[PDB]
């Protein structure tokens, strides 16, 4: 597996990430305590994921750039830009866990739930964001793609925040209005909150580093990647309820938080007026027995089978899009990524 190959090299690079980020302290001992906190935040929140996004930058880089230009310096920059995407991920998740009132992340207590952290986590998340641009400046400032990367990260952050706004607006706490939960709305939420930053960004970053800046090449890459992103969020929604917290590393909250989940949207498409009543009575509440009633209804409508069938139809469709839109990029780039997220 081409991700497995690159992994060990990528993950060890995090030591260098932390080192150069906390040598800002050398020239200013006055901020020592802040730099120590930064290190803690990084070590807690940027480590322990699958690294799909960061590894994708490196894999795509190695597949897009002529082996004659893969010197030690160019490789260090690739790992760094990969870690920038992982820091973006950490920024979004620390804040998302606060807003979604979640308990665990990646198999440990959410950072804001940690004793003595609490809403201070808001500033910690913003620091993670800031570190992206410090890394970009330190490693990439004299490269021709520097400004393109800066604008890409900024734009991806804006899109993600717009998506989060839609997520939160569609799920007002205490106000169960199931008519809002349409497929059209679902698709817009996930495109913005997940697809751009999780799928387009890491490949686009590699493309810029390879000198592929053409409007057309990026537009074609998007057509494939945003579709993969939709599937990825749908899988996340399924896993919120039907996943084993021991494997996912996080306790589900979509029902309690009144979210426009793929599951609730599919339920509303199949529900008799009497099933609709059950949903309306038990959705968006914290009571464990009410959540259990919604899961039992999902199970009745065979939603887990409907998801299985969506996964298969989706894989076939993404493969068709790769056949059409990959060129002039190597299909391997997209095939590797697809194999990582479906199987």
Ligand X SMILES: C=C(C)CCOP(=O)(O)OP(=O)(O)O
Ligand Y SMILES: O=P(O)(O)C(O)(Cc1cccnc1)P(=O)(O)O
Burial class (CB in 10 A: 0-12, 13-18, 19+), 199: buried
Based on the residue annotation, tell me whether 193 is a catalytic residue of this protein.
Answer: yes
Burial of 205 (0-12, 13-18, 19+ CB in 10 A): buried
Nearer to ligand Y, 92 or 334 (CB): 92
Which are the contacts of 194, defined by CB distance < 8 A and separation ≥ 6?
160, 163, 229, 232, 233, 236
Contact partner at residue 234 from ligand Y, ligand X, a second copy, none, CB < 5 to 8 Å by partner kind: none
97, 167, 254, 257: the active-site residue: 167
Q: Does 230 bind ligand X (CB under 6 A)?
A: no
Based on the residue annotation, tell me whether 91 is a catalytic residue of this protein: yes
Contact positions with ligand Y (CB under 6 A) in 104-123: none
- Choosing among a second copy, Mg ion, ligand Y, none, which partner's interface includes residue 193 (Cβ < 5 to 8 Å by kind)? ligand Y
Pick between residue 6 and residue 236 the one whose CB is nearest to ligand Y. Answer: 236
Residue nearest to ligand X (CB): 49
3-state secondary structure at position 109: strand
Task: Note if 232 is an active site residue.
Answer: yes
Residues 34, 30: Cα–Cα separation, whole Å:
9
How many residues bind ligand Y, per CB under 6 A?
A: 12
Q: Is 290 annotated as a binding residue?
A: no
Of the candidates 232, 240, 254, 257, the residue annotated as catalytic is 232
The token duo for 76 is 């260090």
Report angle CA 253, 254, 257 to the nearest 5 degrees.
Answer: 80
How far apart are alpha carbons 122 and 91 in whole angstroms?
9
Pairing mode, strands 108-109 and 104-105: antiparallel
> CA 196 → CA 96, 314, 329, distances in Å?
17, 18, 19
Q: Is 237 part of the annotated catalytic residue set?
A: yes
Q: Which of Mg ion, ligand Y, ligand X, none lies near 52, with the C-beta cut-off 5 to 8 A by kind?
A: ligand X
Tell me: does residue 96 bind ligand Y (CB under 6 A): yes
92 binds ligand Y (CB under 6 A): yes
Q: Which is nearer to ligand Y, 139 or 199 (CB)?
A: 199
DSSP assignment string, 227-282? HHHHHHHHHHHHHHHHS-HHHHSS---TTTTT---HHHHHHHHH--HHHHHHHHHH
96 part of the active site: yes
Site for ligand Y contains 236 (CB under 6 A)? yes
Q: From the candidates 10, 61, 77, 100, which is the catalytic residue?
A: 100
Beta bridge partners of 104: 109
Catalytic residue among 61, 193, 196, 222: 193
- For the question of residue 105 being annotated catalytic, the response is yes
Binding residues for isopentenyl diphosphate: 50, 53, 89, 106
Residues in touch with ligand X (CB under 6 A): 49-50, 52, 89, 106, 194, 198, 232-233, 236
Q: Which residues are catalytic?
A: 50, 91, 96, 100, 105, 167, 193, 232, 236-237
């Amino acid at each position: 597996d081409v991700y497995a190959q690159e992994k060990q090299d990528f993950v060890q690079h995090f030591s260098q990430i932390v080192r150069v980020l906390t040598e800002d302290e050398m020239g200013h001992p006055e901020i020592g305590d802040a730099i120590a906190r930064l290190k803690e935040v990084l070590e807690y929140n940027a480590i322990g994921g699958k690294y799909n996004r960061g590894l994708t930058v490196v894999v795509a880089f190695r597949e897009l750039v002529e082996p004659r230009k893969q010197d030690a310096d160019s490789l260090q920059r690739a790992w760094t830009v990969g870690w920038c995407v992982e820091l973006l991920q950490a920024f979004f998740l620390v804040a998302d866990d606060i807003m979604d009132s979640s308990l665990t992340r990646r198999g440990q207590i959410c950072w804001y739930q940690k004793p003595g952290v609490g809403l201070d986590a808001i500033n910690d998340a913003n620091l993670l964001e800031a570190c992206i641009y410090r890394l970009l400046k330190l490693y990439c400032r004299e490269q021709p793609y520097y400004l393109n990367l800066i604008e890409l990260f900024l734009q991806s952050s804006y899109q993600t925040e717009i998506g989060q706004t839609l997520d939160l607006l569609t799920a007002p706490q205490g106000n169960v209005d199931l008519v809002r939960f349409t497929e059209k709305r679902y698709k817009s939420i996930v495109k913005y909150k997940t697809a751009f930053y999780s799928f387009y960004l890491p490949i686009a970053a590699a493309m810029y580093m390879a000198g592929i800046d053409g409007e057309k090449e990026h537009a074609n890459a998007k057509k494939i990647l945003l579709e993969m992103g939709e599937f990825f969020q749908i899988q996340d929604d399924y896993l919120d309820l039907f996943g084993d917290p021991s494997v996912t590393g996080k306790i589900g909250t979509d029902i309690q938080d009144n979210k426009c989940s793929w599951l609730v949207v599919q339920c509303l498409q199949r529900a008799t007026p009497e099933q609709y009543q059950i949903l309306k009575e038990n959705y968006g509440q914290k009571e464990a027995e009410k959540v259990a009633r919604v899961k039992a209804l999902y199970e009745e409508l065979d939603l887990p089978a409907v998801f299985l069938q969506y996964e298969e139809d989706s894989y076939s469709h993404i493969m068709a899009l790769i056949e059409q839109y990959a060129a002039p990029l190597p299909p391997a780039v997209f095939l590797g990524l697809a194999r990582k997220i479906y199987k």
